[PDB]
Amino acid sequence: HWGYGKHNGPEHWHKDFPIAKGERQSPVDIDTHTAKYDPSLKPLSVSYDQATSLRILNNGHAFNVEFDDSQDKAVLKGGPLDGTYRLIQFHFHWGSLDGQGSEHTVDKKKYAAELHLVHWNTKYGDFGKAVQQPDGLAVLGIFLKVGSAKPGLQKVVDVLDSIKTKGKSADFTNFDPRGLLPESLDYWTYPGSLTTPPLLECVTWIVLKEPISVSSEQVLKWRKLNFNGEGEPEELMVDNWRPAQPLKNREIKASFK
Numbered sequence: 001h002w003g004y005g006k007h008n009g010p011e012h013w014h015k016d017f018p019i020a021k022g023e024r025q026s027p028v029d030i031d032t033h034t035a036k037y038d039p040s041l042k043p044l045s046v047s048y049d050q051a052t053s054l055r056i057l058n059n060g061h062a063f064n065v066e067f068d069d070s071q072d073k074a075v076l077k078g079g080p081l082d083g084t085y086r087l088i089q090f091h092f093h094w095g096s097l098d099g100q101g102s103e104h105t106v107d108k109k110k111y112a113a114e115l116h117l118v119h120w121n122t123k124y125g126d127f128g129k130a131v132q133q134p135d136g137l138a139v140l141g142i143f144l145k146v147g148s149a150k151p152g153l154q155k156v157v158d159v160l161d162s163i164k165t166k167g168k169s170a171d172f173t174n175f176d177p178r179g180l181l182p183e184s185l186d187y188w189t190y191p192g193s194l195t196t197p198p199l200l201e202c203v204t205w206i207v208l209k210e211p212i213s214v215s216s217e218q219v220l221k222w223r224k225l226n227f228n229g230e231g232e233p234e235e236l237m238v239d240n241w242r243p244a245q246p247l248k249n250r251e252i253k254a255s256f257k
């Protein structure tokens, strides 16, 4: 099945998922000089005060911190969005080395990792129905660089020992995702896709300009996770990122300056 290895990585995905070569695939390189300021864009509204995390899961390609999305609690709205999008999970993509890991790039610069907070459009009722719509998802992307530790991340880092391998999950309540946000909500936005199979073209991407800093020790623990299941040969969960895809007929808009 698909993955990030030599024989099943991103260059192979199109064989099972032909939309891989589609017209609005993600991630993309963000050329900061060609992104146009759009003064009609609104400030992003990130309302996570009532967010209720439930669980953390190693799904064999990343770890997802999952939220109770059965009510309107943690919601993203405003910015480029029409309507209300509910937080369902977040996860990260990271590298084997600090010089790579992000999916989006900024003037070809790769960050050490990238956080994706995934939200679905409430007008479609559930996530499964939402991914079938061109405006079904809003994903907030945040870049990570290695430097000072992110205090708000440590609770995630410390539970990873209990979900080392594919298919393991652990209770993970009362995690506050506001602790993962940078100071500024300045962003770029463009229409795109899921960056993992099925690669559905259902995402409004909102990528924050300001990265957060995590420590070397923090990202080191991510690199000890496994793609494989328990009792299988060990493959470290690293370089779980899709590279930049062709922009094609799309414009990236900036919320700022």
Ligand SMILES: [Zn+2]
Binding pocket: 091, 092, 093, 116, 195
């Ligand atoms: Zn992702």
